[PDB]
Design a protein around this ligand. Structure first.
Ligand code: NA
Length: 96
């Protein structure tokens, strides 16, 4: 796997909103209201360990404000299926 920083544009906001929608499902923090994703945001790309460079999927580490509290979410995304899942949702944490 390899990590990069990526911008906080619409695609990232969607991921962050997706983290908040999943967490609301979970209910651990009660009812959260998505605010925005903020920098810094990281993306991991995972390959197959081969040499044909076959992408398996992706992982993201995001900072996200919901209900004016800052959280750190980890999301995974499958390359072929385009399905996503919320791995971890933590905080509140201090600003980076
Ligand atoms: Na805010």
């Amino acid at each position: 796997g390899e990590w990069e920083i990526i911008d906080i544009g619409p695609f990232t906001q969607n991921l962050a909103k997706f983290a908040v929608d999943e967490e609301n499902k979970i209910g651990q923090y009660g009812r959260l209201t998505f605010n925005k994703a903020i920098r810094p945001c990281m993306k991991k790309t995972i390959y197959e360990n081969e040499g044909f460079r076959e992408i398996k999927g992706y992982e993201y580490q995001l900072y996200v404000y919901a209900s004016d509290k800052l959280f750190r979410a980890d999301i995974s995304e499958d390359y072929k299926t385009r399905g996503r899942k919320l791995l971890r949702f933590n905080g509140p944490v201090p600003p980076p």
